[PDB]
Design a protein around this ligand. Structure first.
Ligand SMILES: Nc1nc2c(ncn2[C@@H]2O[C@H](COP(=O)(O)OP(=O)(O)NP(=O)(O)O)[C@@H](O)[C@H]2O)c(=O)[nH]1
Ligand SMILES: Fc1ccc(CN2C3=NCCCN3c3ccccc32)cc1
Ligand SMILES: [Mg+2]
Lengths: 167, 469, 167
């Protein structure tokens, strides 16, 4: 009964979305990387004692292909909506990503997580309070990660899996 | 062996150690090194490595400025000759002339290969990466001065050649084919009558051909300078990646135009003819190896407004469901089948650029700029080789031209397509979806009826070409 | 999967090694004479039903690079031996190239094709019968080509591939 979950990362480009999945799948004690090789987006993990397989889709770099977003999102059971804490615009776009996900999945209750991502040392413009409140108004978990120290990265994905399992 | 210059009048003769160069576990492959060592290997006396030259010139700007590169190559170029040997001294002492054997061997086996390789880097630099010089006229000046003051008649041929080449690139291509391109095909719209041109009135064979030509040119035009350093994703992306972006925006346009042709065709029968014709166009895309085209169509069918039109899907002929489903399967499992088919066909082809973009991006964000070893900071060169492997695969498909006649009017028709008009994206995207809800409402609401909008026959001429004499 | 083949083009200066290669690669006739130092090209192509990845090395013909050949001859799997049909000196030079390749690769059996380029021209000084005689003494095919009209180009390159394949 090895369950596979199809997770899809979405969010503004140009602000380190990419690091979230890279740090996860990497192991992460290593620091070299090849996205080219197959099963560099597959990852077996043990969440709450039950083992499962994570299949992450991260199309970072393809954001200008805006008409492909439905094609991509349609494939997923769970979603990470990522913004950068030093980019207010990426935070304001979170609404349009959520509405767009609800539409392609044709549901008002799609398992999703809001992730706030620290990509560098430029000042925070989105406090965690605001992000918490948005995430509460949607009835979804909020998780902050660091694009450097791998903090909160496991928490992000595992929470989304918990959100799928308890849907 | 042979004696290298003194390591104090010439920085490029320091012995290799794990403090300045690290190799990968017939020529060796560099994992990491200093810039001195990278440039030395770039122009090594023992062997040529044209792949290293392309990799380096494509990617060096993340670790070394252009002005600095040119200075280091110029430095590498001025190799000190050795002093007269003991035998040379004894001959001169006796009025005779030296054999100068060691000196002549040093010239022929160290200096000459190293200098030519330097000149080869300059040649590839000027001929394939001329933008460093377009964006910095001082750098161009320095380069012309260096090349122009290279004395020595073993170099003369390439010095003169490289001088002309630089002069050409400053103030600045037709094709030959095995066969003749097929006759342009016409359906309802006849030549000249561009006011009638539209999805169903042009020949589906000729829609595919001309979109494929157009999309091939857009693909062929993207240079690695638009990709290296992830610049298409940054705030200056409009400045740095204008061809990559033009290409993507065309793909988006076409995908929305397909969505729009469909959902604005409110009569069910008419809309089925529309979808079926788009699937016929997709079919000629597959024949033509235009994978960008294939996925423009597949993205359109999978979009929110179109995917939900169950009544329409239901009437698509079986053989065309099959074609659409096969194309859609190219995209499953992180493009597993697409990647295998792309690596399988006989070019010309038009790849989907999005996979390449994501790979370059992750390679760059997933690998460290430097490796720290023995308290030294080595350039992580394997990281740059990975990016260059990708830009090389891209360039490999940019070489082959399609054997197809341009039709000026049809080409201008597709260039000018503007489905969104003056409307922003969410406004237009919401419009398409409402059209989808109007023409095939959610259950339990009943299916309305709608009048024909097309006055011309809906029957497809088919996707098999014809041949008069 | 696709087999990779490392081809190499050798011959005297000005015979058209570069024009042949660029014609094969880009369907374009280079009319400028810009002496080569060393250029590398890649070409995916289907030959007799099989997808190949051709690596083509365009080598220097100029005398001043006489000493830099062994390195590239060590790597190449098959060799295009080019002379121009209007240049008899370049045809007498073919012997040297063949002997060199044989020496460097330490085999009497290296896949090669003899190629007589510039066949678009009227002013021919080397006759086919001679070149053919030479090719038979080598046990290899003779193919005449024009980089300008594209005559023979694919035939010379693909024949070489077949020879590597049957080797
Ligand atoms: N008529 C004709 N001219 C040709 C042909 N091939 C090459 N040329 C011309 O002959 C000249 C030399 O071509 P080129 O390919 O540069 O020769 P090369 O073998 O590369 N020389 P090098 O050894 O210096 O690199 C150029 O002016 C080119 O246009 C051919 O098939 N026909
Ligand atoms: F006229 C059309 C054509 C397609 C559609 C949407 N659509 C697909 N697109 C890609 C392949 C599989 N696929 C479907 C399967 C089952 C139902 C709808 C499907 C909707 C109306
Ligand atoms: Mg040449």
């Amino acid at each position: 009964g090895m369950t596979e979950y199809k997770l899809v990362v979405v969010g503004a480009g140009g602000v380190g979305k990419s690091a979230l999945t890279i740090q996860l799948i990497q192991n992460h004690f290593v620091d070299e990387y090849d996205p080219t090789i197959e099963d560099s987006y597959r990852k077996q993990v043990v969440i709450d004692g039950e083992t499962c397989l994570l299949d992450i889709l991260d199309t970072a770099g393809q954001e200008e292909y805006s008409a492909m977003r439905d094609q991509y999102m349609r494939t997923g059971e769970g979603f990470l909506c990522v913004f950068a804490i030093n980019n207010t615009k990426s935070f304001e776009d979170i609404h349009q990503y959520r509405e767009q996900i609800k539409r392609v999945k044709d549901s008002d209750d799609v398992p999703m997580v809001l992730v706030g991502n620290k990509c560098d040392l430029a000042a925070r413009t989105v406090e965690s309070r605001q992000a918490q409140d948005l995430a509460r108004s949607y009835g979804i978990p909020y998780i902050e990660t660091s694009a450097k120290t791998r903090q909160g990265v496991e928490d992000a994905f595992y929470t989304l899996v918990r959100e799928i399992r308890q849907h | 062996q042979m004696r290298l210059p003194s390591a104090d009048v010439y920085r490029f003769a320091e012995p290799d150690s794990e403090e300045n160069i690290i190799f990968e576990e017939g020529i060796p492959i560099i994992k990491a090194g200093t810039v001195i060592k990278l440039i030395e290997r770039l122009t090594y006396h023992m062997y040529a490595d044209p792949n290293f030259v392309r990799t380096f010139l494509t990617t060096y700007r993340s670790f070394c400025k252009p002005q600095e590169l040119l200075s280091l190559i110029i430095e590498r170029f001025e190799i000190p000759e050795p002093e007269p040997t003991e035998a040379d001294r004894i001959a001169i002492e006796n009025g005779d002339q030296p054999l100068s054997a060691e000196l002549k061997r040093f010239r022929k086996e160290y200096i000459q290969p190293v200098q030519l390789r330097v000149l080869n880097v300059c040649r590839h630099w000027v001929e394939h990466h001329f933008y460093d010089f377009e964006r910095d006229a001082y750098l161009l000046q320095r380069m012309e001065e260096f090349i122009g003051t290279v004395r020595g008649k073993a170099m003369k041929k390439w010095v003169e050649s490289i001088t002309k080449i630089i002069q050409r690139k400053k103030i600045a291509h037709n094709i030959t084919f095995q066969s003749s391109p097929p006759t342009v095909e016409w359906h309802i719209s006849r030549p000249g009558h561009i006011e009638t041109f539209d999805l169903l009135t042009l020949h589906p064979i000729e829609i595919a051909r001309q979109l494929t030509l157009l999309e091939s040119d857009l693909y062929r035009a993207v240079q690695p300078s638009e990709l290296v350093g992830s610049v298409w994703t940054k705030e200056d992306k409009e400045i740095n990646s204008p061809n990559l972006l033009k290409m993507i925006r065309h793909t988006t346009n076409l995908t929305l135009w397909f969505e729009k042709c469909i959902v604005e065709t409110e009569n069910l029968e008419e809309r089925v003819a529309v979808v079926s014709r788009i699937i016929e166009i997709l079919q000629v895309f597959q024949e033509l190896n235009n994978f960008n085209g294939v996925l423009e169509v597949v993205s359109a069918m999978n979009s929110s407004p179109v995917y939900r039109l169950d009544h329409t899907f239901e009437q698509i002929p079986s053989r065309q469901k099959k074609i659409l489903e096969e194309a859609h399967e190219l995209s499953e499992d992180h493009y597993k089948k697409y990647l295998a088919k792309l690596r399988s066909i006989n070019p010309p082809c038009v790849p989907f650029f999005g996979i390449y973009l994501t790979n370059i991006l992750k390679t760059e964000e997933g690998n460290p700029e430097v490796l720290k070893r023995h308290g030294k900071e080595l350039i992580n060169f394997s990281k740059r080789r990975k990016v260059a492997e990708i830009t090389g695969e891209i360039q490999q498909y940019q070489n082959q031209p399609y054997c197809l006649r341009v039709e000026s009017d049809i080409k201008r028709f597709f260039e000018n397509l503007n489905p969104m008009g003056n409307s922003m994206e969410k406004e237009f995207t919401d419009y398409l979806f409402n059209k989808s809800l109007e023409i095939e409402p959610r259950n339990p609401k009943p299916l309305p009826r709608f009048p024909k909008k097309y006055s011309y026959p809906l029957k497809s001429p088919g996707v098999r070409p014809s041949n008069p004499r």
